[PDB]
């Protein structure tokens, strides 16, 4: 239901109900939560890559039969990952499927992938963080339209809006996604984690508080081995070798 | 001063001081407030459509006319509508005229319509929610330029920035706007209303609080007839028929 | 280390360690703070223009040179300037160099200028307000990519993202920047200042609080000579002449 697989410091997670377009059930949420918590705790894992099996990323909640609490746990786990997350959207992302996709720090879609909010078509509001992420990602103007009218957006339109950072031919998506994940897995994991904490908080903070948090987290980044390594690397005009500590 | 008219669940409100380009006065604000309160309370109204009479949408505050509290009341009523609002910008929107236009959830402009913040040219700051809406809609970088330099944007540029969602020839604007409003008036009114409550709050909330509010409001959407209808519709591969409750 | 120079109500500040690409040291920060405080207090100054000497704007923290409180003081002073700030990016802006550049209310880059977040390359998080400004300026999607991958962006890409408002040939940059600064120096300084206070706060405020602050600050703008002048100018179809009070 969630396939796992490690590779050069990258934990690859695959949503696996392909015949139902990876539609989301309680069980899948429970398994997804577990994989994410495992990936967080495993120190050998320095990057995650999330994708779907088959033709789709995920068509969202399975409309074949508490549940809210389950989604929320996954989102707290996705958002709080102290490790870069790459998302490879290999096909349709609808409803909470789109929500999950959008939690990637770096996001790639296949030519032929698509995105639809879908919630409103079922008389529901956006969940799994979409009301949070979407206006931040594409701006309020596009958020309003995408949410209220629920159009189906193509990969190329998703790229233009900032829903994804790169579009790639289907057969190359995993190769590029994994290649990016591997590179991130070599990079300064602590700097990544703390930069993400700043981005997650930025909009609700006053400048004063933003400056204070930057100070505190810069303080911590400053005492990592990776920063020592980083400065040394720059001085001795060579690439750094980061360990994530 | 504010024309009203119902049609298939849509309340159409027209700013009507056309010879003064629908420039805004205390009286017009008072009439607008009343129409909006009525529209909110009327259960047979499932969508609103706001437009201007004549050449212009609105040239903003009438410069030939405490008072700020009056604008604010109208904005609380505009923004808090528990019903999709369509805006059809039939000509120039300047100052609080632009503020009002931008409160549409879905916004259409006529080909020769135009937008100017105007405020700074009169030595004023933005009002009527523009300092709120604009940076959210188009991002801080464009907000700074639009506000501090007050250029005049065309319909096509407004479309590119997300200030409007669709551009249409003048003579077709009302037909398309009303047609959109009628379609929204058939859709899940509660889902629309609650989505808007989430969008209004999103930027000041931490992820944790955002997830909590999504849960509460999803809880309520979940107990509407429209959601039952929504799920049933998907199962029995047919279009849903929503009532807004 | 910081060159100063007045001209038609514009204070021009130049970062001057050109041989080290205007890399930032404690001393430079202290000198920059002083110049900014002076510019703030001088009533004859109605605009600032910040630039770099030589090939670069600033390559960020000098890696040859807790300390965060020093940067923060400068940022509080930059952000709280009650006067439009123009920034002319004449060459590379990296790390806190990019942070400082982005505090411009209006920003110009030379053809040939470039931008790099840089922080993550040395295993650090963004500072000097970049985690605050960047997501606001270009949206969260681009912020994620710019910060985590630290690409070097060209002037034209920076323009497309909103990092700068205008790109100009190198030999004309100062002429255009100063010309813009001079125009702003003739405009309604108080309206500028108060608009900036609204923009700085907007994201963490509820609509209700945003409307209240607009009322309070509009109240103040309303009692300036410049507003009287502004209204008078519109009535007597002529350009206003503003004094900034
Ligand atoms: C765009 C998409 C996802 C894909 O369309 P196509 O590419 O055209 O494929 P298809 O629809 O033709 O069908 C593929 C098969 O998979 C099935 N399927 C495709 N989604 C589903 C599905 N969500 N369920 C069951 N079978 C499905 C579908 O029934 C089909 O089986 P069958 O036709 O053989 O019976 C399409 O099916 C669609 O528009 N909607 C379905 C997805 C959808 O609306 N999800 C929103 C659910 S709400 C949500 O995200 C979160 C949520 C959170 C919390 C609390 C409460 C409620 O909701
Ligand atoms: C671009 C626009 C809107 C229209 O351009 P044109 O198509 O060129 O028309 P026009 O300028 O030639 O004027 C047409 C007629 O309507 C009148 N009008 C055209 N705006 C106006 C107008 N805001 N007032 C009166 N008559 C007007 C104008 O004087 C003319 O009347 P007349 O020919 O009967 O003399 C133009 O009038 C303009 O540049 N500026 C007016 C916009 C403006 O400054 N709005 C107020 C900004 S501040 C705000 O919104 C709210 C506010 C609220 C509360 C408290 C304090 C302060 O502010
Ligand atoms: C893209 C850029 C800026 C430009 O590269 P190029 O155009 O290829 O020129 P270049 O690298 O050859 O530089 C020319 C000279 O200036 C020197 N320089 C050029 N930046 C520097 C420099 N940041 N430092 C010393 N010498 C430099 C550099 O060593 C060179 O001298 P050399 O001939 O002795 O090698 C490149 O240097 C780059 O990717 N990164 C350098 C900038 C950088 O890493 N900034 C880190 C900012 S960290 C921050 O903002 C705040 C901070 C706050 C608090 C506490 C701890 C740490 O950090």
PDB file of C-alpha atoms and ligand atoms in Angstrom, chain A residues 218 227 234 237, chain C residues 19-21 23 55 59-64 67-68 71 92 94-97 114 116-119 121-122 124 127 152, ligand 3:
ATOM      1  CA  UNK A 218      21.271  30.474  12.232  1.00  0.00           C
ATOM      2  CA  UNK A 227      28.861  24.566   8.296  1.00  0.00           C
ATOM      3  CA  UNK A 234      34.698  27.527  -0.040  1.00  0.00           C
ATOM      4  CA  UNK A 237      38.088  26.086  -3.857  1.00  0.00           C
TER       5      UNK A 237
ATOM      6  CA  UNK C  19      37.978  44.801  -4.173  1.00  0.00           C
ATOM      7  CA  UNK C  20      36.238  42.247  -1.923  1.00  0.00           C
ATOM      8  CA  UNK C  21      32.968  42.567  -3.895  1.00  0.00           C
ATOM      9  CA  UNK C  23      31.460  41.654   1.173  1.00  0.00           C
ATOM     10  CA  UNK C  55      31.566  44.895 -10.307  1.00  0.00           C
ATOM     11  CA  UNK C  59      28.771  39.029  -2.227  1.00  0.00           C
ATOM     12  CA  UNK C  60      27.295  38.803   1.288  1.00  0.00           C
ATOM     13  CA  UNK C  61      29.051  38.066   4.596  1.00  0.00           C
ATOM     14  CA  UNK C  62      32.851  38.296   4.309  1.00  0.00           C
ATOM     15  CA  UNK C  63      34.005  34.774   5.162  1.00  0.00           C
ATOM     16  CA  UNK C  64      37.398  36.160   6.286  1.00  0.00           C
ATOM     17  CA  UNK C  67      26.558  38.594  15.232  1.00  0.00           C
ATOM     18  CA  UNK C  68      22.994  38.180  13.981  1.00  0.00           C
ATOM     19  CA  UNK C  71      22.345  42.348  10.874  1.00  0.00           C
ATOM     20  CA  UNK C  92      26.206  40.076  -8.016  1.00  0.00           C
ATOM     21  CA  UNK C  94      24.685  36.888  -2.810  1.00  0.00           C
ATOM     22  CA  UNK C  95      23.632  35.863   0.719  1.00  0.00           C
ATOM     23  CA  UNK C  96      22.892  38.884   2.935  1.00  0.00           C
ATOM     24  CA  UNK C  97      23.904  40.913  -0.111  1.00  0.00           C
ATOM     25  CA  UNK C 114      22.865  38.258 -10.708  1.00  0.00           C
ATOM     26  CA  UNK C 116      22.227  33.834  -5.423  1.00  0.00           C
ATOM     27  CA  UNK C 117      20.803  32.975  -2.007  1.00  0.00           C
ATOM     28  CA  UNK C 118      24.148  31.298  -1.232  1.00  0.00           C
ATOM     29  CA  UNK C 119      23.362  30.542   2.428  1.00  0.00           C
ATOM     30  CA  UNK C 121      26.044  26.340   0.022  1.00  0.00           C
ATOM     31  CA  UNK C 122      27.876  26.973   3.323  1.00  0.00           C
ATOM     32  CA  UNK C 124      23.482  28.051   6.722  1.00  0.00           C
ATOM     33  CA  UNK C 127      19.272  35.742   7.385  1.00  0.00           C
ATOM     34  CA  UNK C 152      22.552  31.771  -9.726  1.00  0.00           C
TER      35      UNK C 152
HETATM   36  C1  LIG D   3      28.179  33.894  -7.029  1.00  0.00           C
HETATM   37  C2  LIG D   3      29.394  34.445  -6.253  1.00  0.00           C
HETATM   38  C3  LIG D   3      28.883  35.502  -5.280  1.00  0.00           C
HETATM   39  C4  LIG D   3      30.325  35.198  -7.249  1.00  0.00           C
HETATM   40  O1  LIG D   3      31.347  34.351  -7.830  1.00  0.00           O
HETATM   41  P1  LIG D   3      32.370  34.783  -9.038  1.00  0.00           P
HETATM   42  O2  LIG D   3      31.745  35.843  -9.869  1.00  0.00           O
HETATM   43  O3  LIG D   3      32.814  33.529  -9.696  1.00  0.00           O
HETATM   44  O4  LIG D   3      33.710  35.506  -8.299  1.00  0.00           O
HETATM   45  P2  LIG D   3      34.793  34.861  -7.198  1.00  0.00           P
HETATM   46  O5  LIG D   3      34.088  33.850  -6.371  1.00  0.00           O
HETATM   47  O6  LIG D   3      36.064  34.475  -7.855  1.00  0.00           O
HETATM   48  O7  LIG D   3      35.119  36.155  -6.213  1.00  0.00           O
HETATM   49  C5  LIG D   3      36.072  37.215  -6.466  1.00  0.00           C
HETATM   50  C6  LIG D   3      36.880  37.545  -5.173  1.00  0.00           C
HETATM   51  O8  LIG D   3      36.150  38.091  -3.990  1.00  0.00           O
HETATM   52  C7  LIG D   3      36.220  37.110  -2.867  1.00  0.00           C
HETATM   53  N1  LIG D   3      34.894  36.833  -2.179  1.00  0.00           N
HETATM   54  C8  LIG D   3      33.712  36.741  -2.798  1.00  0.00           C
HETATM   55  N2  LIG D   3      32.776  36.479  -1.893  1.00  0.00           N
HETATM   56  C9  LIG D   3      33.366  36.394  -0.704  1.00  0.00           C
HETATM   57  C10 LIG D   3      32.863  36.152   0.512  1.00  0.00           C
HETATM   58  N3  LIG D   3      31.552  35.961   0.570  1.00  0.00           N
HETATM   59  N4  LIG D   3      33.635  36.103   1.611  1.00  0.00           N
HETATM   60  C11 LIG D   3      35.017  36.318   1.466  1.00  0.00           C
HETATM   61  N5  LIG D   3      35.522  36.578   0.179  1.00  0.00           N
HETATM   62  C12 LIG D   3      34.682  36.607  -0.877  1.00  0.00           C
HETATM   63  C13 LIG D   3      36.715  35.803  -3.483  1.00  0.00           C
HETATM   64  O9  LIG D   3      37.452  34.997  -2.530  1.00  0.00           O
HETATM   65  C14 LIG D   3      37.566  36.252  -4.689  1.00  0.00           C
HETATM   66  O10 LIG D   3      38.974  36.505  -4.353  1.00  0.00           O
HETATM   67  P3  LIG D   3      40.195  35.492  -4.700  1.00  0.00           P
HETATM   68  O11 LIG D   3      40.703  35.929  -6.026  1.00  0.00           O
HETATM   69  O12 LIG D   3      41.057  35.748  -3.547  1.00  0.00           O
HETATM   70  O13 LIG D   3      39.597  34.123  -4.707  1.00  0.00           O
HETATM   71  C15 LIG D   3      30.154  33.293  -5.478  1.00  0.00           C
HETATM   72  O14 LIG D   3      31.322  33.782  -4.757  1.00  0.00           O
HETATM   73  C16 LIG D   3      29.240  32.389  -4.564  1.00  0.00           C
HETATM   74  O15 LIG D   3      28.530  31.513  -5.068  1.00  0.00           O
HETATM   75  N6  LIG D   3      29.290  32.557  -3.218  1.00  0.00           N
HETATM   76  C17 LIG D   3      30.104  33.541  -2.484  1.00  0.00           C
HETATM   77  C18 LIG D   3      29.179  34.366  -1.596  1.00  0.00           C
HETATM   78  C19 LIG D   3      28.872  33.600  -0.307  1.00  0.00           C
HETATM   79  O16 LIG D   3      29.198  32.418  -0.170  1.00  0.00           O
HETATM   80  N7  LIG D   3      28.212  34.313   0.619  1.00  0.00           N
HETATM   81  C20 LIG D   3      27.856  33.704   1.890  1.00  0.00           C
HETATM   82  C21 LIG D   3      26.942  34.652   2.617  1.00  0.00           C
HETATM   83  S1  LIG D   3      26.688  34.060   4.321  1.00  0.00           S
HETATM   84  C22 LIG D   3      25.744  35.523   4.971  1.00  0.00           C
HETATM   85  O17 LIG D   3      25.158  36.260   4.186  1.00  0.00           O
HETATM   86  C23 LIG D   3      25.668  35.879   6.504  1.00  0.00           C
HETATM   87  C24 LIG D   3      26.350  35.216   7.539  1.00  0.00           C
HETATM   88  C25 LIG D   3      26.136  35.777   8.806  1.00  0.00           C
HETATM   89  C26 LIG D   3      26.623  35.443  10.082  1.00  0.00           C
HETATM   90  C27 LIG D   3      27.467  34.419  10.527  1.00  0.00           C
HETATM   91  C28 LIG D   3      28.105  33.426   9.782  1.00  0.00           C
HETATM   92  C29 LIG D   3      28.052  33.241   8.397  1.00  0.00           C
HETATM   93  O18 LIG D   3      27.208  34.078   7.302  1.00  0.00           O
END
